[PDB]
């Protein structure tokens, strides 16, 4: 048996047999006063001190939050959804110990993804008992409030103020620091990554000054805060905010004295009125979400990026190659993902109205005009491939790639991927190629557990993005030193080299997405 002791208390973990090796996992340590009653909403209080030995055997209560139900008894989707009882009690971490204890491990820090309305580091792809036993290093997850009791937003008043997600990591990263040595960790080595609205946020992260000291260096796996969905106004968020008030009745005018009532109100009412507060949402509505709150953030962020603003560090970036498809099956019409989802010029029109609803008739047939002057005719796939291109270029890549250009023109070294592997246990279907999200179970190294049925290749790529993570957490550089592997060069805004992860191939390639992005992230804005 092992027993650790933190700053507040003394916890028990328990022992994993992993590889022929060990990995001590504790699962479920309370980094905060629960956030109920008086403090739904506020940001998290701070945790008082316990004499008993916490059990951290395992996963805690996963965050309150929605459940998608589009595909019931389909792994695909169902592998995202929670795996533990969700509560309001639900702020705690996980940490993933190499046995035996080391000396002075970097620490790797996870942050899920999810629109901010959805996620929990339970999920099976967060295992980070193969990273421990591999690389030896100390990995640490969380779960954050997310949807509404996590980012509603009553600008400036504190019984709302926003971002008490953000917040909630924050203090996680505080409690690695005070605790993780102890651990064996190594606090002054500390990588922050995460997926999606994970990686917005440890962009945002890399923004805030609270979390400046919090941490080393950061790895954004599809994502960043300067993406459309990643960042909800100011005013259109106490619009959203007031929009619910109504719903659940609990519109009073002394400001705060519509809090109070949300907190008579029970978790399941609040819920459900999220959807409609936007009035029309999209595949991709983060309903409640980060905004400036003038404690995490102050100020809006893309000006923070554009007159450097942040931590001076390396990051590591990158995206997929078919980011765009898995949201085409959630709403777009002639999709699905039991055929194969051929759409013709009109499916495809109407599909824009659907990503881009508030936006213009010229806004988009501008779209249109980019993506159908096609490369050439016959293909019934066009459409069906350029709406995927849409939502994916709009949505993940060009964000990334101007985050990547825009940080690293203050002299900080930049890497950036292109992961292009279609996973063989991949349950969804082959048109939607290489989806949002399936790139987090090969940087886990769940393909090197030969029992759950990976191509041998496919071992061996996980084998090497593993070894890169981690020489990044650790070294600053993801470079594969020994298998004679390709070196994976600085992005500069000049030239702009990314590396390609697939089985067959590291390739050096340049200037990504070049004519899509310039429409995106230019002519496209103007309207
Ligand atoms: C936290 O966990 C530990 C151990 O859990 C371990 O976890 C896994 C991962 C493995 O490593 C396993 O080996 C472990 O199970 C818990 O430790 C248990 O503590 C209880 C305390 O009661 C033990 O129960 C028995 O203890 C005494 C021994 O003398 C008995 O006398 C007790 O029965 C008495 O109950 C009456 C009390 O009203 C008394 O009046 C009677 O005379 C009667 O004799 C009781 O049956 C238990 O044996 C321990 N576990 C093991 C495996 O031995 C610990 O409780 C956990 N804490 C939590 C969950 O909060
Ligand atoms: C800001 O809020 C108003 C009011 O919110 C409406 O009510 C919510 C319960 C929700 O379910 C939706 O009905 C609305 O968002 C919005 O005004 C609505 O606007 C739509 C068209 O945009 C109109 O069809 C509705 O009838 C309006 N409802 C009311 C009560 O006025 C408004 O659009 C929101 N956004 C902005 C930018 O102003
Ligand atoms: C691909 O499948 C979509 C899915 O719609 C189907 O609707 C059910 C009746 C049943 O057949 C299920 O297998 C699917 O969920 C098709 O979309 C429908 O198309 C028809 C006519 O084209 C239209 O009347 C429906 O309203 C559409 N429904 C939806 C949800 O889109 C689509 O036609 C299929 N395309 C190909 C090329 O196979
Ligand atoms: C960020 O993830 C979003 O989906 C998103 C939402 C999701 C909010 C509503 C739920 C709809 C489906 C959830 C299933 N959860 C999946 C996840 C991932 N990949 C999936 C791939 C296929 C099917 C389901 C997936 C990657 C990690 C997160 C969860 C709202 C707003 C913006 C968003 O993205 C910017
Ligand atoms: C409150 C919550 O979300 N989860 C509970 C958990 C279960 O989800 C619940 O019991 C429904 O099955 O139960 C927990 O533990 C119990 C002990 O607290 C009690 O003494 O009785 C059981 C003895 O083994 C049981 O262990 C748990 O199992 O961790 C508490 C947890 O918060
Ligand atoms: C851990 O490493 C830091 C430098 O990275 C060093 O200053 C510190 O003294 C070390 N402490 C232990 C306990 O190894
Ligand atoms: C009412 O509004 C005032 C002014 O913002 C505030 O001080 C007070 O706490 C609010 N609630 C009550 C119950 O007075
Ligand atoms: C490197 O190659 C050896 C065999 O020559 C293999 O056993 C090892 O696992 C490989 N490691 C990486 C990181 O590719
Ligand atoms: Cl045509
Ligand atoms: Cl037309
Ligand atoms: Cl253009």
């Given at each position: 048996d092992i027993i650790?002791?933190?700053?507040?208390?003394?916890?028990?973990?328990?022992?994993?047999?992993?590889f022929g090796g060990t990995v001590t996992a504790f699962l479920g340590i309370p980094y905060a006063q629960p956030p109920l009653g008086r403090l739904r909403f506020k940001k998290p209080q701070s945790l008082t001190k316990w004499s008993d030995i916490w059990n951290?055997?395992?996963?805690?209560?996963?965050?309150?939050?929605?459940?998608?139900?589009?595909?019931?008894?389909?792994?695909g989707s169902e592998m995202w959804n929670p795996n533990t009882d969700l509560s309001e009690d639900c702020l705690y971490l996980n940490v993933w110990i190499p046995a035996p204890k080391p000396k002075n491990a970097t620490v790797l820090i996870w942050?899920?993804?999810?629109?901010?309305?959805?996620?929990?580091?339970?999920?099976?792809?967060?295992?980070?008992?193969?990273?421990?036993?591999?690389?030896?290093?100390?990995?640490?997850?969380?779960?954050?409030?997310?949807?509404?009791?996590?980012?509603?937003?009553?600008?400036?008043?504190?019984?709302?103020?926003?971002?008490?997600?953000?917040?909630?990591?924050?203090l996680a990263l505080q409690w690695v620091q005070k605790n993780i040595a102890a651990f064996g960790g190594n606090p002054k080595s500390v990588t922050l990554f995460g997926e999606s609205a994970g990686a917005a946020s440890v962009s945002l992260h890399l923004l805030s000054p609270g979390s400046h000291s919090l941490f080393t260096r950061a790895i954004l796996q599809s994502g960043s805060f300067n993406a459309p969905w990643?960042?909800?106004?100011?005013?259109?968020?106490?619009?959203?905010?007031?929009?619910?008030?109504?719903?659940?009745?609990?519109?009073?005018?002394?400001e705060t004295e519509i809090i109070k009532c949300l907190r008579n109100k029970d978790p399941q009412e609040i819920l459900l009125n999220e959807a409609f507060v936007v009035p029309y949402g999209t595949?991709?509505?983060?309903?409640?979400?980060?905004?400036?709150?003038?404690?995490?953030?102050?100020?809006?962020?893309?000006?923070?990026?554009?007159?450097?603003?942040?931590?001076?560090?390396?990051?590591?970036?990158?995206?997929?190659?078919?980011?765009?498809?898995?949201?085409?099956?959630?709403?777009?019409?002639?999709?699905?993902?039991?055929?194969?989802?051929?759409?013709?010029?009109?499916?495809?029109?109407?599909?824009?109205?659907?990503?881009?609803?508030?936006?213009?008739?010229?806004?988009?047939?501008?779209?249109?005009?980019?993506?159908?002057?096609?490369?050439?005719?016959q293909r019934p796939e066009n459409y069906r491939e350029a709406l995927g291109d849409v939502v994916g270029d709009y949505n993940f890549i060009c964000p990334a790639l101007?985050?990547?250009?825009?940080?690293?023109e203050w002299g900080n070294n930049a890497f950036f991927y292109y992961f292009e592997h279609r996973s063989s246990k991949l349950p969804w279907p082959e048109w939607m190629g290489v989806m949002h999200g399936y790139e987090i179970e090969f940087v886990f190294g769940l393909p090197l557990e030969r029992r759950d049925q990976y191509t041998k290749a496919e071992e061996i790529l996980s084998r090497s993005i593993v070894?890169?993570?981690?020489?990044?957490?650790?070294?600053?550089?993801?470079?594969?030193?020994?298998?004679?592997?390709?070196?994976?060069?600085?992005?500069?805004?000049?030239?702009?080299?990314?590396?390609?992860?697939?089985?067959?191939?590291?390739?050096?390639?340049?200037?990504?997405?070049?004519?899509?992005?310039?429409?995106?992230t230019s002519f496209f804005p103007k309207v």
């Open positions: 650790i002791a933190t700053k507040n208390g003394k916890v028990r973990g328990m022992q994993l047999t992993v951290a055997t395992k996963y805690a209560n996963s965050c309150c939050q929605n459940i998608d139900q589009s595909f019931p008894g389909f792994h942050i899920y993804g999810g629109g901010f309305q959805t996620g929990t580091s339970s999920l099976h792809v967060y295992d980070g008992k193969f990273l421990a036993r591999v690389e030896r290093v100390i990995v640490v997850s969380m779960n954050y409030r997310v949807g509404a009791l996590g980012f509603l937003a009553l600008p400036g008043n504190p019984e709302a103020p926003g971002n008490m997600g953000l917040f909630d990591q924050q990643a960042v909800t106004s100011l005013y259109e968020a106490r619009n959203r905010t007031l929009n619910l008030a109504k719903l659940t009745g609990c519109s009073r005018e002394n595949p991709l509505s983060v309903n409640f979400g980060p905004t400036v709150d003038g404690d995490f953030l102050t100020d809006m962020p893309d000006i923070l990026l554009e007159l450097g603003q942040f931590k001076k560090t390396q990051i590591l970036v990158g995206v997929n190659k078919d980011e765009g498809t898995a949201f085409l099956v959630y709403g777009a019409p002639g999709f699905s993902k039991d055929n194969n989802s051929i759409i013709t010029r009109k499916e495809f029109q109407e599909g824009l109205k659907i990503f881009f609803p508030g936006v213009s008739e010229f806004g988009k047939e501008s779209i249109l005009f980019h993506y159908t002057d096609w490369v050439d005719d101007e985050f990547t250009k825009k940080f690293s070894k890169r993570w981690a020489n990044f957490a650790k070294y600053g550089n993801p470079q594969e030193t020994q298998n004679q592997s390709t070196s994976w060069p600085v992005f500069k805004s000049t030239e702009q080299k990314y590396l390609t992860l697939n089985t067959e191939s590291t390739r050096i390639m340049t200037k990504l997405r070049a004519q899509q992005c310039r429409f995106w």
